[PDB]
Amino acid sequence: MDLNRMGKDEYYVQITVDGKEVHSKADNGQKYKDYEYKLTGFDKDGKEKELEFTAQKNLRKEAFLRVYHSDKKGVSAWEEVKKDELPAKVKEKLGVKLEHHHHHH
Numbered sequence: 001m002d003l004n005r006m007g008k009d010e011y012y013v014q015i016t017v018d019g020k021e022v023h024s025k026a027d028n029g030q031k032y033k034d035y036e037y038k039l040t041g042f043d044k045d046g047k048e049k050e051l052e053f054t055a056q057k058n059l060r061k062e063a064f065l066r067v068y069h070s071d072k073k074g075v076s077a078w079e080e081v082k083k084d085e086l087p088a089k090v091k092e093k094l095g096v097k098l099e100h101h102h103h104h105h
Contacts, residue, residue, distance in 0.1 A: 009069035011041025011049055012090065018061040022054065035059075041067055042094065051075060 020036035037059070038052030051067065053075045059065070060080045067078040083090065 009043060011043050011051065011067045011069055012086070013039050013041045013051075013065045013067055015039070015059065015061045015063055015065055019058065025054075041069075043069075046093065053078070 017037055017039055021033040022036050023033050025034045034054040035058050036052060036054055041049040041051050043049060063080045064083055064086060065078055065080050067075055069075060
């Protein structure tokens with residue numbers, strides 16, 4: 001893990017697609033299967049990135065997953081969180097409602 005300058009991207013995704021066992025990973029000739037999670041990732045800027053990462057284990061569905069990103073390999077490290085653990089600004093980014101300027105004068 002070369003720290004150097006980091007400057008790494010993180011896409012806030014939501015695990016909607018689950019249980020995709022890709023048995024195409026037979027390779028040696030066994031019954032071991034990776035899981036496919038292809039979804040729309042939202043970056044800090046506010047774009048829509050298309051990414052599909054395969055995991056050895058089946059991860060937490062319905063959760064908000066923070067996926068790391070770098071140009072030389074796309075994806076490698078990622079962590080599972082909830083909207084409560086994320087900054088409220090994320091809700092002010094996606095999921096904003098009207099009448100939310102409700103303040104006393």
